[PDB]
Coordinates of C-alpha atoms and ligand atoms in Angstrom, one line a residue:
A78 CA 48.5 32.9 -21.7
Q79 CA 48.8 34.0 -18.0
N80 CA 48.3 37.7 -17.0
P81 CA 47.2 38.8 -20.5
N82 CA 46.6 42.3 -19.4
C83 CA 50.1 42.6 -18.0
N84 CA 48.9 43.6 -14.5
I85 CA 51.6 43.8 -11.7
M86 CA 51.4 40.8 -9.6
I87 CA 52.1 40.5 -5.7
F88 CA 53.3 37.2 -4.3
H89 CA 53.3 36.1 -0.8
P90 CA 55.9 33.2 -0.5
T91 CA 55.9 30.8 2.6
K92 CA 59.3 30.5 4.2
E93 CA 59.7 27.0 2.5
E94 CA 59.0 28.7 -0.9
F95 CA 61.6 31.4 0.0
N96 CA 64.5 29.0 0.2
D97 CA 65.2 28.6 -3.6
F98 CA 65.4 31.8 -5.3
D99 CA 65.7 30.8 -8.8
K100 CA 62.7 28.3 -8.3
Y101 CA 60.6 31.0 -7.1
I102 CA 61.3 33.5 -9.9
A103 CA 60.6 30.7 -12.4
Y104 CA 57.2 30.2 -10.4
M105 CA 56.1 33.8 -10.8
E106 CA 56.9 33.7 -14.5
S107 CA 54.7 30.5 -14.8
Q108 CA 51.9 32.9 -13.6
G109 CA 52.5 35.5 -16.1
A110 CA 54.3 38.0 -13.6
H111 CA 57.1 38.9 -15.9
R112 CA 54.5 40.3 -18.4
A113 CA 53.9 43.5 -16.2
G114 CA 57.6 44.2 -16.4
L115 CA 57.5 44.4 -12.4
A116 CA 56.4 42.1 -9.4
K117 CA 56.0 42.6 -5.8
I118 CA 57.3 40.1 -3.4
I119 CA 56.3 40.4 0.3
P120 CA 58.7 38.0 2.2
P121 CA 57.1 35.5 4.9
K122 CA 56.6 36.9 8.3
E123 CA 59.3 34.7 9.7
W124 CA 62.1 36.5 7.6
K125 CA 64.3 39.4 8.2
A126 CA 67.0 41.1 6.2
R127 CA 69.1 42.2 9.4
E128 CA 68.4 42.5 13.2
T129 CA 68.2 46.1 13.2
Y130 CA 69.0 49.4 11.3
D131 CA 70.0 51.2 14.5
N132 CA 73.8 51.3 13.3
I133 CA 73.9 52.4 9.7
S134 CA 74.6 56.0 10.3
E135 CA 78.5 55.9 9.5
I136 CA 78.0 54.6 6.1
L137 CA 79.5 57.3 3.7
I138 CA 77.6 58.7 0.8
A139 CA 80.9 59.5 -1.2
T140 CA 79.1 61.3 -4.0
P141 CA 75.6 62.6 -3.1
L142 CA 73.8 63.8 -6.4
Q143 CA 71.6 66.8 -6.6
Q144 CA 69.1 65.9 -9.2
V145 CA 68.4 69.2 -11.0
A146 CA 65.2 69.3 -13.5
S147 CA 64.8 70.8 -16.9
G148 CA 61.7 71.0 -18.8
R149 CA 57.9 70.8 -18.0
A150 CA 56.0 69.1 -15.2
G151 CA 55.2 66.3 -17.3
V152 CA 58.2 65.9 -19.6
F153 CA 61.4 66.8 -18.3
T154 CA 65.1 65.7 -17.9
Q155 CA 67.3 65.7 -14.9
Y156 CA 71.0 65.9 -14.4
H157 CA 73.2 65.2 -11.5
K158 CA 75.3 67.7 -9.7
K159 CA 77.8 66.2 -7.5
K160 CA 77.9 67.4 -3.9
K161 CA 80.5 67.0 -0.9
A162 CA 80.5 63.7 0.7
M163 CA 78.4 62.8 3.8
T164 CA 77.5 60.2 6.2
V165 CA 74.2 58.6 5.9
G166 CA 73.4 60.3 9.5
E167 CA 74.0 63.6 8.0
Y168 CA 71.9 62.8 4.9
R169 CA 69.0 61.6 7.0
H170 CA 69.1 64.9 8.8
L171 CA 69.2 66.6 5.5
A172 CA 66.3 64.5 4.2
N173 CA 64.2 65.5 7.1
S174 CA 65.0 69.2 7.1
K175 CA 62.3 71.8 6.3
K176 CA 63.8 72.3 2.7
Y177 CA 63.8 68.5 1.6
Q178 CA 61.1 66.8 3.9
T179 CA 58.0 65.2 2.6
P180 CA 55.1 67.6 2.5
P181 CA 51.8 67.0 4.4
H182 CA 49.7 64.6 2.4
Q183 CA 46.4 62.9 2.7
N184 CA 47.3 59.4 1.1
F185 CA 49.8 57.9 -1.5
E186 CA 47.6 59.3 -4.3
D187 CA 47.7 62.8 -2.9
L188 CA 51.5 62.7 -2.6
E189 CA 51.8 61.3 -6.2
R190 CA 49.7 64.4 -7.5
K191 CA 52.3 66.8 -5.7
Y192 CA 55.2 64.9 -7.0
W193 CA 54.2 65.4 -10.5
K194 CA 53.1 68.9 -10.1
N195 CA 55.9 70.2 -8.2
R196 CA 58.9 67.8 -8.8
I197 CA 60.7 70.3 -11.4
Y198 CA 60.9 73.0 -8.9
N199 CA 63.0 71.3 -6.4
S200 CA 66.6 69.7 -6.5
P201 CA 66.5 66.7 -4.1
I202 CA 69.8 64.9 -3.2
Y203 CA 70.1 61.0 -3.7
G204 CA 72.8 58.9 -2.4
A205 CA 72.5 56.4 -5.4
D206 CA 74.8 53.4 -6.4
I207 CA 76.8 52.9 -3.4
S208 CA 78.7 49.7 -3.6
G209 CA 77.6 47.4 -0.5
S210 CA 75.0 45.5 1.3
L211 CA 72.9 45.9 4.4
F212 CA 71.8 42.0 4.5
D213 CA 73.2 40.2 7.6
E214 CA 75.4 37.5 6.4
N215 CA 73.5 34.9 8.5
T216 CA 70.3 35.8 6.3
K217 CA 70.3 32.7 4.0
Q218 CA 66.9 33.5 2.0
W219 CA 66.9 36.2 -0.5
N220 CA 70.2 37.9 0.3
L221 CA 71.1 40.1 -2.6
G222 CA 74.7 39.8 -1.7
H223 CA 74.4 36.0 -2.1
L224 CA 72.7 35.6 -5.4
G225 CA 74.2 33.2 -8.2
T226 CA 76.1 35.8 -10.7
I227 CA 75.3 36.6 -14.0
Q228 CA 78.6 35.4 -15.1
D229 CA 77.8 31.9 -13.8
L230 CA 74.3 32.0 -15.2
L231 CA 75.9 32.5 -18.7
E232 CA 78.4 29.8 -18.0
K233 CA 76.0 27.2 -17.0
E234 CA 73.6 28.1 -20.0
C235 CA 76.1 28.7 -22.8
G236 CA 79.4 27.3 -21.4
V237 CA 80.8 30.9 -21.7
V238 CA 83.6 31.6 -19.4
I239 CA 84.0 35.5 -18.8
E240 CA 85.7 38.1 -16.5
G241 CA 83.6 40.1 -14.2
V242 CA 81.7 40.4 -11.1
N243 CA 78.0 41.1 -9.7
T244 CA 77.7 42.8 -6.4
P245 CA 74.9 44.9 -4.8
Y246 CA 74.3 48.7 -4.5
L247 CA 72.7 50.7 -2.0
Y248 CA 70.3 53.7 -2.4
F249 CA 69.7 56.4 -0.1
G250 CA 66.9 58.5 -1.0
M251 CA 64.7 61.5 0.2
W252 CA 61.3 63.1 -1.0
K253 CA 61.2 63.6 -4.8
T254 CA 64.3 61.7 -5.5
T255 CA 63.7 60.2 -8.8
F256 CA 64.9 57.3 -11.0
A257 CA 64.4 58.1 -14.8
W258 CA 62.8 55.8 -17.4
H259 CA 65.2 53.0 -18.2
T260 CA 65.7 49.1 -18.5
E261 CA 68.4 47.6 -16.8
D262 CA 71.9 47.0 -18.2
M263 CA 71.7 44.3 -21.1
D264 CA 67.8 44.2 -20.3
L265 CA 68.9 42.2 -17.2
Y266 CA 66.5 41.5 -14.4
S267 CA 66.7 43.6 -11.0
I268 CA 65.7 43.0 -7.7
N269 CA 65.2 45.8 -5.1
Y270 CA 64.7 45.6 -1.4
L271 CA 63.4 48.5 0.4
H272 CA 65.4 48.1 3.8
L273 CA 63.7 51.0 5.7
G274 CA 61.9 54.4 5.7
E275 CA 59.4 55.8 3.5
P276 CA 57.9 54.3 0.4
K277 CA 58.9 54.1 -3.3
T278 CA 56.6 54.6 -6.2
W279 CA 57.3 52.6 -9.4
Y280 CA 55.7 53.0 -12.9
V281 CA 56.5 50.2 -15.4
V282 CA 55.8 49.6 -19.1
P283 CA 55.1 46.1 -20.0
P284 CA 58.1 44.5 -21.9
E285 CA 55.9 43.6 -25.0
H286 CA 55.1 47.3 -25.3
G287 CA 58.5 48.8 -24.5
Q288 CA 59.0 49.8 -28.1
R289 CA 55.8 52.0 -27.5
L290 CA 57.7 53.9 -24.7
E291 CA 60.7 54.3 -27.0
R292 CA 58.7 55.8 -29.8
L293 CA 57.1 58.4 -27.5
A294 CA 60.3 59.3 -26.0
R295 CA 61.7 59.8 -29.5
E296 CA 58.9 62.2 -30.1
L297 CA 59.1 64.0 -26.7
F298 CA 62.9 64.4 -26.6
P299 CA 63.7 64.7 -30.5
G300 CA 67.2 66.3 -30.2
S301 CA 68.2 63.5 -27.9
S302 CA 66.8 60.9 -30.2
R303 CA 69.0 62.3 -33.2
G304 CA 72.0 62.2 -30.9
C305 CA 71.8 58.6 -29.9
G306 CA 70.0 55.5 -31.2
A307 CA 69.2 54.4 -27.5
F308 CA 69.1 57.7 -25.3
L309 CA 67.1 56.1 -22.6
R310 CA 70.3 54.4 -21.7
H311 CA 71.5 57.7 -20.2
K312 CA 68.8 57.4 -17.7
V313 CA 67.8 61.2 -17.5
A314 CA 64.3 61.4 -19.2
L315 CA 61.2 61.7 -17.2
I316 CA 57.6 61.3 -18.6
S317 CA 54.5 61.7 -16.1
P318 CA 51.7 59.0 -15.9
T319 CA 49.5 61.8 -17.4
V320 CA 51.3 62.2 -20.3
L321 CA 51.9 58.5 -20.9
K322 CA 48.0 58.1 -20.7
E323 CA 47.4 61.0 -23.1
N324 CA 49.6 59.1 -25.6
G325 CA 48.0 55.6 -25.1
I326 CA 51.2 54.2 -23.5
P327 CA 50.3 50.8 -21.6
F328 CA 51.8 51.2 -18.1
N329 CA 51.1 50.2 -14.4
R330 CA 52.0 51.7 -11.1
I331 CA 52.7 50.4 -7.5
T332 CA 54.0 51.5 -4.5
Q333 CA 56.8 49.7 -2.4
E334 CA 56.9 49.9 1.2
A335 CA 59.7 49.0 3.6
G336 CA 60.3 45.4 4.1
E337 CA 59.1 44.7 0.4
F338 CA 61.1 43.3 -2.7
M339 CA 60.3 44.3 -6.2
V340 CA 61.9 42.4 -9.4
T341 CA 62.0 44.2 -12.6
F342 CA 61.9 41.9 -15.7
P343 CA 63.9 41.9 -18.8
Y344 CA 63.1 45.1 -20.8
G345 CA 60.6 46.2 -18.4
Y346 CA 61.0 50.1 -18.6
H347 CA 60.4 51.5 -15.2
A348 CA 60.7 54.8 -13.5
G349 CA 59.7 56.3 -10.0
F350 CA 60.4 58.5 -6.9
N351 CA 61.0 58.2 -3.3
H352 CA 58.3 59.5 -0.6
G353 CA 60.8 60.6 1.9
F354 CA 64.0 59.2 3.7
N355 CA 64.7 55.6 2.7
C356 CA 67.3 53.1 2.0
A357 CA 67.1 50.4 -0.8
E358 CA 69.4 47.7 -2.0
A359 CA 69.4 46.4 -5.3
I360 CA 71.3 44.0 -7.7
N361 CA 71.2 42.8 -11.4
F362 CA 70.5 39.1 -12.0
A363 CA 69.9 36.6 -14.9
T364 CA 67.9 33.5 -15.5
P365 CA 68.0 31.5 -18.7
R366 CA 65.0 33.4 -20.3
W367 CA 67.0 36.7 -19.9
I368 CA 69.8 35.3 -22.6
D369 CA 67.5 36.1 -25.6
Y370 CA 66.9 39.7 -24.1
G371 CA 70.5 40.2 -23.5
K372 CA 71.7 39.3 -27.2
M373 CA 69.2 42.0 -28.5
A374 CA 69.4 44.7 -25.9
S375 CA 69.6 48.1 -27.6
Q376 CA 72.7 50.3 -26.7
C377 CA 73.8 53.8 -26.4
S378 CA 75.5 54.9 -29.9
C379 CA 77.0 58.1 -28.8
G380 CA 79.2 57.1 -25.7
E381 CA 77.3 59.0 -23.0
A382 CA 75.9 55.8 -21.2
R383 CA 78.3 54.4 -18.6
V384 CA 79.4 50.8 -19.4
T385 CA 80.6 48.8 -16.3
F386 CA 83.5 46.5 -16.2
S387 CA 81.2 43.5 -16.2
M388 CA 78.8 44.9 -18.8
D389 CA 81.7 44.8 -21.2
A390 CA 81.9 41.1 -21.2
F391 CA 78.3 40.7 -21.7
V392 CA 78.3 42.8 -24.9
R393 CA 81.3 41.1 -26.2
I394 CA 79.9 37.8 -25.9
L395 CA 76.3 38.1 -26.6
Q396 CA 76.6 41.1 -29.2
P397 CA 79.9 40.8 -30.8
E398 CA 79.0 43.2 -33.9
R399 CA 77.7 45.9 -31.6
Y400 CA 80.8 45.3 -29.5
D401 CA 83.1 45.6 -32.6
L402 CA 81.6 48.7 -33.9
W403 CA 81.6 50.3 -30.5
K404 CA 85.3 49.7 -29.8
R405 CA 86.3 50.9 -33.3
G406 CA 84.0 54.1 -32.9
Ligands
LIG214 C1 77.9 53.2 -24.9 N1 78.1 52.4 -25.9 C2 78.4 53.2 -27.1 O1 78.5 54.1 -27.3 C3 78.1 51.8 -28.1 O2 78.4 51.9 -29.4 C4 77.9 50.6 -27.6 C5 77.5 49.3 -27.9 C6 77.5 48.5 -26.7 C7 77.3 48.9 -25.7 C8 77.5 50.1 -25.3 C9 77.9 51.0 -26.1
LIG215 O1 65.7 52.4 -6.4 C1 66.1 53.3 -7.6 O2 66.3 54.5 -7.4 C2 66.3 52.6 -8.8 N1 66.1 51.1 -8.7 C3 66.0 50.5 -10.0 O3 65.8 51.1 -11.0 C4 66.0 49.0 -9.8 O4 65.9 48.5 -8.8 O5 66.0 48.3 -10.8
LIG216 NI1 66.1 49.8 -12.6
LIG217 ZN1 74.0 57.6 -26.0

């Protein structure tokens, strides 16, 4: 079996290889990339997402989120406090202010140490989940607004015809902004392009070991576990690499820089943080291999987790028993 240690693999496609998206995902998996839960793809040198980022400041962040932590440095939750709307220009200025800016640091490792030491004592503001795209419409390769849809994948594979759409989201981050431990909706893939700015550090558990992370989470957040059979679906729990190591949880880490893609694979738990002001674009997608993961994706049982319009149809078709129980609940 390829990649038995489940290492994060890094790919350097040629421009010819960058034409067929589906084919290249399949190629990465033939090399065992999915076993890590996460892969990095460096686009060919000839490729560009768009001409410049000089004109993005008037994008609105309608609901910036202040990420307030509760708990200890290595085991905490975060909740999102809604803030008043601001433009990306205003947000960038805030990110760079003395209160919120990245501290002096020696390297990525030094900054990582500072993040896990000091994260809980600050409340950075995140512009997350903003529907839209920064890819030029003339960018024909790996344009996250031009991917085949999950609905069409299900139709091609299963003859299933359903409602729903599939569009990208923008993320404007700053130092210490955090994404909690999670897999994707329906344990889909995701693909994430870092358009500009400072890096994003990722942590990931191999899909074959996801239930080890779940078991630790149940131990570390016992009240939450009693309240919901899949509370990581709430996307508010953080566990540090030190605590993962202490508990023998298999994981890897990698830092994504501007101009690089990351792909998360079905049931690959991931978490991470931003180094400073940046902008990323991400979207979920499917392949034929995903369908078996979608049908057995664990779901929130308490109603706290958000379910998009499109996810409704996925649950209805792939998980009819869960759907029925949920709608009667
Ligand atoms: C949020 N949520 C629930 O609360 C539930 O029972 C369920 C089942 C499938 C997908 C989502 C669900
Ligand atoms: O970038 C973020 O804040 C979170 N991104 C993801 O979880 C993803 O792309 O799957
Ligand atoms: Ni994700
Ligand atoms: Zn729940």
